[PDB]
Write an enzyme that holds these catalytic residues in place. Structure first.
Site, PDB file in Angstrom:
ATOM      1  N   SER A  45     113.262  74.871 -44.761  1.00 53.23           N
ATOM      2  CA  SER A  45     114.287  75.651 -43.812  1.00 53.23           C
ATOM      3  C   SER A  45     113.620  76.655 -42.923  1.00 53.23           C
ATOM      4  O   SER A  45     114.241  77.367 -42.370  1.00 53.23           O
ATOM      5  CB  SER A  45     115.179  76.470 -45.046  1.00 53.23           C
ATOM      6  OG  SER A  45     115.963  75.587 -45.604  1.00 53.23           O
ATOM      7  N   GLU A 143     117.396  65.961 -45.965  1.00 50.73           N
ATOM      8  CA  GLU A 143     116.079  64.912 -45.930  1.00 50.73           C
ATOM      9  C   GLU A 143     114.861  65.540 -45.285  1.00 50.73           C
ATOM     10  O   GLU A 143     113.887  65.077 -45.638  1.00 50.73           O
ATOM     11  CB  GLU A 143     116.478  63.710 -44.997  1.00 50.73           C
ATOM     12  CG  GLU A 143     117.384  62.722 -45.966  1.00 50.73           C
ATOM     13  CD  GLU A 143     118.826  63.252 -45.773  1.00 50.73           C
ATOM     14  OE1 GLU A 143     119.250  63.978 -44.800  1.00 50.73           O
ATOM     15  OE2 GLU A 143     119.732  62.590 -46.592  1.00 50.73           O
ATOM     16  N   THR A 210     112.437  81.804 -45.549  1.00 51.64           N
ATOM     17  CA  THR A 210     111.702  80.988 -46.460  1.00 51.64           C
ATOM     18  C   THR A 210     112.070  79.457 -46.488  1.00 51.64           C
ATOM     19  O   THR A 210     113.084  79.080 -45.758  1.00 51.64           O
ATOM     20  CB  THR A 210     111.771  81.419 -47.950  1.00 51.64           C
ATOM     21  OG1 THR A 210     113.176  81.445 -48.263  1.00 51.64           O
ATOM     22  CG2 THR A 210     111.140  82.920 -48.042  1.00 51.64           C
ATOM     23  N   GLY A 211     111.447  78.568 -47.113  1.00 51.33           N
ATOM     24  CA  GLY A 211     111.649  77.197 -47.214  1.00 51.33           C
ATOM     25  C   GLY A 211     111.241  76.550 -48.575  1.00 51.33           C
ATOM     26  O   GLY A 211     110.098  77.304 -49.014  1.00 51.33           O
TER      27      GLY A 211
END
Ligand SMILES: OC[C@H]1O[C@H](O[C@H]2[C@H](O)[C@@H](O)[C@H](OCCCCCCC3CCCCC3)O[C@@H]2CO)[C@H](O)[C@@H](O)[C@@H]1O
Length: 265
Positions: A45, A143, A210-211
């Site tokens: 993200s 995905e 963030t991710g």
């Protein structure tokens, strides 16, 4: 905490994973710390900041409005839509979509915006147009978080991402208002921002996105500094570790602690 580079190493040895990190002066681009800075990591993200930069470029050109309302359908939603699932009747503005993507990590919001910039190919083209020849988006949410070992899809490098973030925030490619908007969205992060403030010493500025992905993938793209100033860009990615989310978060925080304890370099 030890010196930043020593802490980064310790994090690799404890996670059994690769860390990629850069620390860069926001105003000048001076690189202060670099570790695996030319190696690829999944963006997860974190790509949403670049996405919103592309949206803002369209706004500045007169091809988009942050006011414009987009109406969408339930069949457009993907996993994790905390804001967008609430607006099937009334839609969301482009600017609200940006805010939901960056401040809540709303995945459907991100896909809706990706559609407006030509999909993953369109966003990659925008990156090339701002001089990032490395970062690539290939897939949509969710995905793009698959983080297969060795897969180049949906990756950046710490150096690329830091340079690109600096270009979007400061280089006058975007209008003054657009630069200010992108920054405010990162200041407004609700996913990690408030937690990070709760553990930062008084006086330290934070803005972030963030991710999280598979195989341990985790990352943050942040602005940090003392004296309530966004002094530095800090980009940290982790990949290919089996560790708990808690321990990955702790190791990223520990790198932050090392920076705070050894800031003057
Ligand atoms: O001497 C420096 C400081 O040392 C401690 O501060 C600690 C703090 O108590 C702890 O909670 C934090 O953890 C680090 C938290 C960082 C989390 C976010 C980091 C993000 C930011 C940028 C992107 C990468 C990661 O470390 C600092 C430094 O040791 C003291 O508590 C504080 O009084 C003192 O001013």
């Amino acid at each position: 905490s030890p010196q930043p580079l020593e802490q980064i190493k310790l994090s690799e040895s404890q996670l059994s994973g690769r860390v990629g990190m850069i620390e860069m002066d926001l105003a000048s681009g001076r690189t202060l710390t670099a570790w695996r800075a030319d190696e690829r990591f999944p963006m997860m993200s974190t790509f949403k900041v670049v996405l919103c930069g592309a949206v803002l470029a369209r706004v500045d050109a007169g091809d988009e409005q942050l006011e414009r309302k987009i109406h969408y359908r339930q069949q457009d939603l993907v996993d994790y839509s905390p804001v967008s699932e609430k607006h099937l009747a009334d839609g969301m503005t482009v600017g609200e979509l940006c805010a939901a993507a960056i401040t809540m990590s709303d995945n459907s919001a991100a896909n809706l915006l990706l559609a407006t910039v030509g999909g993953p190919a369109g966003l990659t083209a925008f990156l090339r147009q701002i001089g990032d020849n490395v970062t690539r988006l290939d897939r949509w949410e969710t995905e793009l978080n698959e983080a297969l070992p060795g897969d180049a899809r949906d990756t950046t490098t710490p150096a690329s991402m830091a340079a690109t973030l600096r270009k979007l925030l400061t280089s006058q490619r975007l209008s003054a208002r657009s630069q200010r908007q992108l920054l405010q969205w990162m200041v407004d992060d609700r996913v990690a921002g408030p937690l990070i403030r709760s553990v930062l010493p008084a006086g330290w500025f934070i803005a972030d996105r963030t991710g999280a992905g598979e195989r341990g993938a985790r990352g943050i793209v942040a602005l940090l500094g003392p004296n309530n100033k966004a002094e530095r860009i800090v980009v940290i990615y982790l990949r290919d570790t089996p560790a708990s989310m808690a321990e990955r978060n702790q190791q990223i925080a520990g790198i932050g602690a090392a920076l705070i304890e050894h800031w003057q370099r």
